Design a binder for this molecule. Structure first.
Ligand SMILES: [Cl-]
Ligand SMILES: [Cl-]
Ligand SMILES: [Cl-]
Ligand SMILES: [Cl-]
Ligand SMILES: [Cl-]
Ligand SMILES: [Cl-]
Lengths: 160, 159, 158
């Protein structure tokens, strides 16, 4: 693991705040608590995000994965990984890491990005019957996206 | 079809913002409150927002439906100066920031672009204090929540 | 003369921010609160902000009038490292973000630029927990709302 001082700075700034950040053994990997945006079927949901910062950060974007289950066209259902193409449309070397959590993810949950879906089934349901899809979402969220399920989705070695 | 226009419209609607739809994603009305600490602070306006076919490479157009006095806003039509919008707009710009950042900042103090309301520009530079009083009065009569709601075309106004 | 500087000064003043004017748009004082979740969180400072004649092509200068301990700030003069400001500043940068984003983020963790305060850099590296305790105590004595107010030059102090 190499001495990237931009990665170190941004990790420390994220931790030195009111955000709920659970560390690994390195600044390259950590877990961040995330709340679904108000006014969406995700609004009552809590998720744990697996965030990784690459060795050439911030020239390469962070990777983001939902640890507990989420249903979203741009998110792989099994792994939780957020589509790399969608992240790269927003990310630049000047982009503020905080805005991933404050702007990018909430906006993404408000309506998907038109990028080729990682969850094809969610894309199909959204376009066929949005009202029914939203009801399906709310139910899924109430069961999978509790604060408790988010907490237990942190790997045991780093779970409080 | 313009998938980016669709996306940004839907994200605006799927929020706590007060957005009143037309029959298409290309046109809609948004409630807007004047920024605190300005003569506009007690005002409510309805914004006529249009998203062009080549959005977001071409910027949205923005119009105040109920009356506002501002150097960069055409008094009769309510249209916000296109040159002023283009100084801020880029294909990467977030549509929400038009309402959250661009418009509030604009109302805090005008952009030095050739004014659409030349009277407002001259009053502002001759006597700022008197102009601010003139604004507060105009705002208290024309920028009520009621006047904002009524300025939505009848076909799309909540009944 | 400089219409952009005039515009950005007026927008800063026409808000809920606490801005204390000088005799010109080129120089003024802004109240600043330390960011929550840091050893600076209970702090209030007065910032000496100067907008140059070639603004916004040249960045503003920022000085902490009442004392702060931070690797990227010279305590004696108060001045925020010019190199750090220039990493963020561009002619399209919004002045409000200096106060809302740039300074709060800087206080959460220093920029790796050669420190103006070498003492603070050494303390942070050697023992972060002890340094954060040192910070909290310093802040409680030097960064009160009263000390921030008194640090404005008497000619422009309310
Ligand atoms: Cl660590
Ligand atoms: Cl997106
Ligand atoms: Cl529609
Ligand atoms: Cl502007
Ligand atoms: Cl002045
Ligand atoms: Cl910085």
């Amino acid at each position: 693991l190499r001495s990237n001082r931009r990665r170190e700075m941004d990790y420390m700034r994220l931790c030195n705040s009111t955000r709920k950040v659970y560390p690994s053994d390195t600044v390259a990997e950590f877990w961040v608590e995330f709340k679904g945006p108000e006014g969406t079927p995700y609004e009552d949901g809590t998720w744990m995000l697996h965030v990784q910062l690459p060795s050439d950060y911030p020239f390469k974007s962070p990777s983001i994965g939902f640890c507990n289950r989420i249903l979203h066209p741009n998110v792989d259902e099994r792994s939780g990984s957020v589509c790399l193409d969608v992240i790269n449309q927003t990310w630049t070397p000047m982009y503020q890491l905080e805005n991933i959590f404050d702007v990018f993810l909430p906006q993404l949950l408000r309506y998907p990005n038109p990028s080729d879906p990682l969850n094809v089934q969610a894309a199909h349901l959204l376009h066929a019957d949005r009202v029914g899809f939203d009801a399906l979402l709310r139910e899924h969220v109430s069961t999978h996206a509790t604060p408790q399920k988010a907490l237990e989705s942190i790997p045991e070695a780093y779970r409080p």
